[PDB]
């Protein structure tokens, strides 16, 4: 930890990192460069309460645990020279650094087939995006969502509540193909279908002509607006240009170190080890952005602290469904607690591999999720009969370990 | 480049690296730790002339361009402490380092289904392996090879020349699935089949009982010996334990830097950017081991030197077939020069992507390979008609650029 600290990006990962630096006891200079001209804010409300209600002052990140930080908002870092230890800014200034931290996140993938479209086509990542989409979410208007990931599905629910007609096109045979158990994805499709979402599986966009979207089965979908949510790509251009190892994401170890000395990276921009799978992965979760930012800061200030070690997990709020998912989507066995039903949805899934818990899902069952994450963290091997039995208290089981 | 230099592993990558350090002008200490108790040697002859003729003194690497190096042969590096800058050795000694270089290569993957086998099962990576296999390559004996990669196929040819009966089992529908054009792989299968190799495609080993190998189609193969060649796994255990980013291979940038300061890696142990695909890959080629070792050394001594930038390529000598392959296995177009025929095999393949050469293959046409690699390196876009036309001289075409 060499002063001064410069952080590129002013999202959740950055805010979490800088607050932890200060809390851990680092009092040297911190400067954060943020390309969006916005008070740092949280993104999940953009598909939900902000989309529905439009108050950005409800979604700002709390920066008060990060005192004495200069936030350069509306400024783009254009390059860094890792030999000179400088960052070149879009406003013509240069920042010196002792330690450089890349927290630049990821940007929505565009749809190459809609590149020359004339009808409104948006992605949903920023406050600017959300405002632009909202301005067109008229009751009885027709929205097409491309991509059946959590963001698209969150938007689908919000749009339906607002009285917007929703069609959704997914290239895969299922929704949430990235990190959701099949049982969950199947149920989620049944739910959205029941709420009026027109789901198209195993279809891809091939183009558009004058307010109509074209599919690879040779059919058409009319829409007033398309929102594209087919995933993100790491914002790793500065790292690539400066000679760091990256591949749609900057490779980091558990300390957040890149291949370039004095340069760290954290959050959505990173490709990191998933301890459960043992493989490198770009983890895109809110929990990772916060916790990885915190762990990297803690170890920078206190080198005796352990590296980042958390197992991945996320939530997704989709209308009546409060979904929580931890760990791996599958193992050699899935245990189901409760009925899987559209009538008052409430259930839990537990994924086991050789007797060990490797993943869990809770739908409208937050109470069970925390204990399951604890059991997951220690690689617990509980009695499978007990895991299935509705009389079992999971909090009691997690406490017994 | 901080002295002293310690290199772990004494294979081709290591030898190439240390020779380049000396040639580039570094005269500080160099110590190489090599777990095999063997004068450093080259591996390709192990499937060919060494297997056939058995003289290890024909296959030693020339270390004379690496004067004043202490080679600790028959010694295993057990751990390194990247804070203390020390390496712990199996003989009880500790080495200090200014710069640590991990050149530990990769080890054959074992077949989990043959783990408890009673019949002879070998892999082919080391001189010890090759000697052990040779001692059983009796004329008219029955060899089963698992895996249709270049090493297995090289061994298949050598065994057939020696009068050994050869069966080969491949899980994929084709041979050389890793980095060979389909046209090449198809031809290679026809060739080996014509030489008496019993090829089994889309079959996997499920086990063995008393000198018989069992397959997943529910059938049996009797063999006097099994040689397993289903790929390798990076020898990255020391890196993993020391906190470096790795995923079946140590992630490095074009300077050979790992995520740990003062620790570099090169050769088969590394996962690195393939500039053609733009993706990270563990490149397993002889050319990579040598050239990446050389490039990393050059840049350590002269930081103004460029990073490693070579495009991947390999050869494979399979009986009558002298195969050379560069770049990507496919593009949007393949051009074929010559007839593809078992009668005096001689042909060239050129892979193009949007008019640009992205790959080439030569079979018994070494003359054409060097020019094609030059055209590949610059991303040349030659006339497709000219590329097809047998009157075209490729050396003249590469010279014109
Ligand atoms: C609509 C939406 C809904 C979501 N809902 C959920 C959910 O239900 N569950 C869940 O787990 N996650 C949710 N996510 C939250 C998401 O997980 C977090 O926003 C993300 O993980 C935070 O990561 P980050 O801070 O690394 O990146 P970011 O939030 O992307 O921040 C990086 C910042 O750096 C900026 N930047 C990039 N390059 C430069 C440069 N060169 N110079 C200066 N600045 C630069 C970017 O523009 C950006 O502002 C949702 C996200 C969106 C967009
Ligand atoms: C049978 C065979 C045939 C081949 N034919 C071809 C071919 O036709 N075309 C082609 O391109 N390539 C061929 N290859 C050559 C291959 O490409 C090279 O041998 C390889 O790329 C060299 O890489 P390396 O030096 O990084 O690793 P290695 O050669 O594996 O050397 C690493 C050395 O480090 C040692 N080591 C590992 N851990 C430790 C430790 N902790 N302490 C001390 N030492 C350690 C290993 O035991 C090993 O001796 C063939 C290889 C084999 C085995």
Tab-separated table of C-alpha atoms in Angstrom, chain B residues 116-279:
chain	number	residue	atom	x	y	z
B	116	UNK	CA	-6.928	-49.326	-10.004
B	117	UNK	CA	-5.787	-51.218	-13.127
B	118	UNK	CA	-3.506	-54.254	-12.788
B	119	UNK	CA	-2.234	-54.348	-16.402
B	120	UNK	CA	0.599	-51.946	-17.479
B	121	UNK	CA	-0.695	-48.400	-17.908
B	122	UNK	CA	1.727	-45.599	-18.719
B	123	UNK	CA	1.733	-42.010	-19.758
B	124	UNK	CA	4.350	-40.598	-22.096
B	125	UNK	CA	6.003	-37.410	-20.891
B	126	UNK	CA	9.463	-38.271	-19.546
B	127	UNK	CA	12.551	-40.249	-20.497
B	128	UNK	CA	11.588	-42.652	-17.646
B	129	UNK	CA	8.141	-43.104	-19.278
B	130	UNK	CA	9.606	-43.650	-22.730
B	131	UNK	CA	12.110	-46.234	-21.488
B	132	UNK	CA	9.326	-48.098	-19.630
B	133	UNK	CA	7.044	-48.131	-22.701
B	134	UNK	CA	9.907	-49.228	-25.000
B	135	UNK	CA	10.750	-52.183	-22.737
B	136	UNK	CA	7.248	-53.470	-23.613
B	137	UNK	CA	6.963	-52.528	-27.328
B	138	UNK	CA	7.538	-56.130	-28.462
B	139	UNK	CA	6.802	-56.947	-32.118
B	140	UNK	CA	3.258	-58.389	-32.386
B	141	UNK	CA	2.380	-57.166	-28.864
B	142	UNK	CA	-0.880	-55.224	-28.535
B	143	UNK	CA	-0.828	-51.556	-27.606
B	144	UNK	CA	-3.902	-49.499	-26.714
B	145	UNK	CA	-3.507	-45.725	-26.886
B	146	UNK	CA	-6.125	-43.588	-25.092
B	147	UNK	CA	-6.397	-40.192	-26.756
B	148	UNK	CA	-6.025	-39.131	-30.377
B	149	UNK	CA	-3.826	-36.071	-29.823
B	150	UNK	CA	-0.462	-35.543	-31.500
B	151	UNK	CA	1.552	-37.467	-28.883
B	152	UNK	CA	-0.692	-40.574	-29.124
B	153	UNK	CA	-0.591	-40.442	-32.925
B	154	UNK	CA	3.175	-39.988	-32.993
B	155	UNK	CA	3.483	-43.042	-30.744
B	156	UNK	CA	0.935	-44.933	-32.903
B	157	UNK	CA	3.176	-44.470	-35.968
B	158	UNK	CA	6.350	-45.488	-34.147
B	159	UNK	CA	4.658	-48.560	-32.693
B	160	UNK	CA	3.344	-49.630	-36.140
B	161	UNK	CA	6.808	-49.234	-37.711
B	162	UNK	CA	8.146	-51.475	-34.903
B	163	UNK	CA	5.518	-54.133	-35.823
B	164	UNK	CA	3.312	-53.516	-32.777
B	165	UNK	CA	-0.480	-53.835	-33.193
B	166	UNK	CA	-2.167	-50.548	-32.260
B	167	UNK	CA	-5.695	-49.759	-31.142
B	168	UNK	CA	-6.627	-46.170	-30.307
B	169	UNK	CA	-9.640	-44.889	-28.419
B	170	UNK	CA	-10.821	-41.292	-28.791
B	171	UNK	CA	-13.774	-39.705	-26.942
B	172	UNK	CA	-14.340	-37.125	-29.681
B	173	UNK	CA	-15.604	-37.902	-33.189
B	174	UNK	CA	-12.199	-36.825	-34.555
B	175	UNK	CA	-8.455	-36.938	-33.855
B	176	UNK	CA	-6.414	-33.866	-32.876
B	177	UNK	CA	-9.541	-32.025	-31.741
B	178	UNK	CA	-7.523	-29.405	-29.787
B	179	UNK	CA	-5.952	-27.331	-32.606
B	180	UNK	CA	-6.226	-28.978	-36.043
B	181	UNK	CA	-8.475	-28.143	-38.977
B	182	UNK	CA	-11.202	-30.752	-39.570
B	183	UNK	CA	-9.825	-31.439	-43.074
B	184	UNK	CA	-6.467	-32.283	-41.524
B	185	UNK	CA	-7.932	-34.401	-38.704
B	186	UNK	CA	-10.048	-36.379	-41.193
B	187	UNK	CA	-7.050	-37.044	-43.406
B	188	UNK	CA	-4.867	-38.041	-40.433
B	189	UNK	CA	-7.498	-40.641	-39.415
B	190	UNK	CA	-7.542	-42.070	-42.961
B	191	UNK	CA	-3.723	-42.292	-42.882
B	192	UNK	CA	-3.437	-44.120	-39.556
B	193	UNK	CA	-6.314	-46.450	-40.486
B	194	UNK	CA	-4.421	-47.343	-43.688
B	195	UNK	CA	-1.301	-48.119	-41.603
B	196	UNK	CA	-3.234	-50.630	-39.515
B	197	UNK	CA	-4.296	-48.531	-36.511
B	198	UNK	CA	-7.644	-49.740	-35.065
B	199	UNK	CA	-9.408	-46.406	-34.425
B	200	UNK	CA	-12.373	-46.162	-32.024
B	201	UNK	CA	-14.191	-42.824	-32.155
B	202	UNK	CA	-16.706	-41.443	-29.661
B	203	UNK	CA	-15.696	-44.078	-27.101
B	204	UNK	CA	-14.450	-43.639	-23.545
B	205	UNK	CA	-12.688	-45.963	-21.149
B	206	UNK	CA	-15.008	-47.040	-18.286
B	207	UNK	CA	-12.516	-49.405	-16.653
B	208	UNK	CA	-10.482	-52.582	-17.001
B	209	UNK	CA	-10.419	-56.168	-15.761
B	210	UNK	CA	-7.370	-58.483	-15.965
B	211	UNK	CA	-5.636	-57.331	-19.194
B	212	UNK	CA	-8.822	-56.121	-20.871
B	213	UNK	CA	-9.946	-52.501	-21.253
B	214	UNK	CA	-13.680	-51.674	-21.003
B	215	UNK	CA	-15.478	-49.030	-23.098
B	216	UNK	CA	-18.703	-47.023	-22.617
B	217	UNK	CA	-20.388	-48.697	-25.594
B	218	UNK	CA	-20.210	-51.802	-23.407
B	219	UNK	CA	-17.370	-53.480	-25.326
B	220	UNK	CA	-13.844	-54.758	-24.591
B	221	UNK	CA	-10.305	-54.215	-25.930
B	222	UNK	CA	-7.505	-56.635	-25.042
B	223	UNK	CA	-4.043	-55.028	-24.768
B	224	UNK	CA	-0.583	-55.856	-23.408
B	225	UNK	CA	-0.106	-52.203	-22.510
B	226	UNK	CA	-2.123	-48.995	-22.332
B	227	UNK	CA	-0.513	-45.609	-23.004
B	228	UNK	CA	-2.698	-42.759	-21.818
B	229	UNK	CA	-2.405	-39.467	-23.706
B	230	UNK	CA	-5.585	-37.537	-22.938
B	231	UNK	CA	-3.860	-34.203	-22.386
B	232	UNK	CA	-1.860	-32.561	-19.652
B	233	UNK	CA	-2.509	-30.462	-16.565
B	234	UNK	CA	-0.304	-27.523	-15.653
B	235	UNK	CA	2.220	-28.124	-12.898
B	236	UNK	CA	1.042	-24.973	-11.058
B	237	UNK	CA	0.771	-26.308	-7.510
B	238	UNK	CA	3.518	-24.074	-6.090
B	239	UNK	CA	1.934	-21.010	-7.676
B	240	UNK	CA	-1.522	-21.935	-6.318
B	241	UNK	CA	-0.162	-22.395	-2.805
B	242	UNK	CA	1.730	-19.098	-2.926
B	243	UNK	CA	-1.371	-17.140	-3.928
B	244	UNK	CA	-0.813	-16.528	-7.671
B	245	UNK	CA	-3.752	-16.443	-10.108
B	246	UNK	CA	-3.998	-19.819	-11.825
B	247	UNK	CA	-6.601	-22.071	-13.416
B	248	UNK	CA	-4.923	-25.209	-14.797
B	249	UNK	CA	-2.046	-22.906	-15.592
B	250	UNK	CA	-0.510	-19.709	-14.250
B	251	UNK	CA	-1.928	-16.534	-15.793
B	252	UNK	CA	0.805	-14.365	-17.342
B	253	UNK	CA	0.922	-11.248	-19.470
B	254	UNK	CA	3.226	-10.784	-22.495
B	255	UNK	CA	6.168	-10.081	-20.169
B	256	UNK	CA	5.676	-13.391	-18.368
B	257	UNK	CA	4.558	-11.638	-15.173
B	258	UNK	CA	2.264	-13.500	-12.788
B	259	UNK	CA	0.006	-11.729	-10.279
B	260	UNK	CA	2.803	-11.990	-7.699
B	261	UNK	CA	5.570	-9.354	-7.869
B	262	UNK	CA	9.044	-10.725	-8.823
B	263	UNK	CA	7.516	-14.040	-9.955
B	264	UNK	CA	7.329	-14.869	-13.676
B	265	UNK	CA	6.171	-17.967	-15.513
B	266	UNK	CA	6.751	-19.375	-18.980
B	267	UNK	CA	6.085	-22.403	-21.169
B	268	UNK	CA	3.585	-25.234	-20.680
B	269	UNK	CA	2.703	-24.105	-17.129
B	270	UNK	CA	1.266	-20.762	-18.388
B	271	UNK	CA	-2.179	-19.607	-19.520
B	272	UNK	CA	-1.522	-16.738	-21.917
B	273	UNK	CA	-3.158	-14.572	-24.567
B	274	UNK	CA	-3.448	-16.065	-28.021
B	275	UNK	CA	-3.355	-12.843	-30.110
B	276	UNK	CA	-5.225	-14.531	-32.971
B	277	UNK	CA	-8.237	-15.586	-30.916
B	278	UNK	CA	-7.706	-12.773	-28.388
B	279	UNK	CA	-8.411	-15.329	-25.643
